[PDB]
């Protein structure tokens, strides 16, 4: 199952393996046990180039995991500034609330990521 392999390749940051899997049409909308898509996983780990290729490929920028988080939630929580910027440009929803009622801005605040919180507030 190429979707399962794409999830793990995106998580571990294997650019070459991500390229081969997508060249074989691996499902960019696959979800892991936590409901995370490849875009979620690359946004969590900080793999900017994989985030960008997934966005060029019809990945849902606002897909939600089992806790209601979007990829922008993850990038804002961890503090991946460049990924936050590309997700916003691709249409990430700044108002999406997870199952704790938190927007990405709220997670940026909660995790001390000041610059990202400023970026998100100007995009509100």
């Amino acid at each position: 199952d190429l979707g399962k392999k794409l999830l793990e390749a995106a998580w571990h940051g294997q650019d070459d393996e991500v390229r081969i899997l997508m060249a074989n049409g691996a499902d960019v909308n696959a979800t892991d046990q936590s409901g995370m898509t490849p875009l979620h996983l690359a946004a969590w780990r900080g793999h900017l180039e994989i985030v960008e290729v997934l966005l060029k490929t019809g990945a849902d920028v606002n897909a939600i995991d089992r806790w209601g988080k979007t990829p922008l939630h993850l990038a804002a929580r961890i503090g991946h500034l460049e990924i936050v910027e590309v997700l916003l440009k691709a249409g990430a929803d700044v108002n999406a609330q997870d199952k704790f009622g938190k927007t990405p801005f709220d997670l940026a605040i909660d995790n001390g990521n000041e610059d990202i919180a400023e970026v998100l507030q100007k995009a509100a």
Binding site: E8, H12, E17, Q33, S34, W44
Partner: protein
């Protein structure tokens, strides 16, 4: 027989590894395509714990080896007699245990009273400030080829997140080859996978 099933659980538990490549002198390297770590005997093997939410204080992290092949899975993974008797303990690890943790004075080593399986367990601690994951430094104390022990049989390492009473919170696993030339062997096994 110990479960090897991936179970990310309520805390969203995943494992991460370094990007170490396949150069001639590499000491530990992880193949995502194989979900397999290649490492040299007794060298530091960093394993990253990634969690979507922080498990509570009192959570513990256990590591245990099992044989990957079904016909060997019921046999306890142990060090070979040569290495068991070579007096190389750090003073914490029993000399028969394959998996050690380095750099953690709160490590505990368990010999299961019923199954006789070995495991090594540390307290879970959240990431250090600035960090996104908790790293544990494992050491593997026999080569896969050790004839009195693993005798060229592949093993899995099972990492379990447990509460203070031993209940399951999350589980992940990866194959391990302990060998002289991890970079060469990773490159070889990844090329073989491309052919098959």
């Amino acid at each position: 027989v110990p479960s090897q099933k991936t179970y990310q659980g309520s805390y969203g538990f995943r494992l991460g590894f370094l990007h170490s490549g396949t150069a001639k002198s590499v000491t530990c390297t992880y193949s995502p395509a194989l979900n397999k770590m290649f490492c040299q005997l007794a060298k530091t093997c960093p394993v990253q714990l990634w969690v979507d939410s922080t498990p509570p204080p009192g959570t513990r992290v256990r590591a245990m080896a099992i044989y990957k092949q079904s016909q060997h899975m019921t046999e306890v993974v142990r060090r070979c007699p040569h290495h068991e008797r070579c007096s190389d303990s750090d003073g914490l690890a029993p000399p028969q245990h394959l998996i050690r943790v380095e750099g953690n004075l709160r490590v505990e080593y368990l010999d299961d009273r019923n199954t006789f399986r070995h495991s090594v367990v540390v307290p879970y601690e959240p990431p250090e400030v600035g960090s996104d994951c908790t790293t544990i430094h494992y050491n593997y104390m026999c080569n896969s080829s050790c004839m009195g022990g693993m005798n060229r049989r592949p093993i899995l390492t099972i990492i379990t997140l447990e509460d203070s009473s031993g209940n399951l919170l999350g589980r992940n696993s990866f194959e391990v080859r302990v060998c002289a030339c991890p970079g060469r062997d990773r490159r070889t096994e990844e090329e073989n996978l491309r052919k098959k």
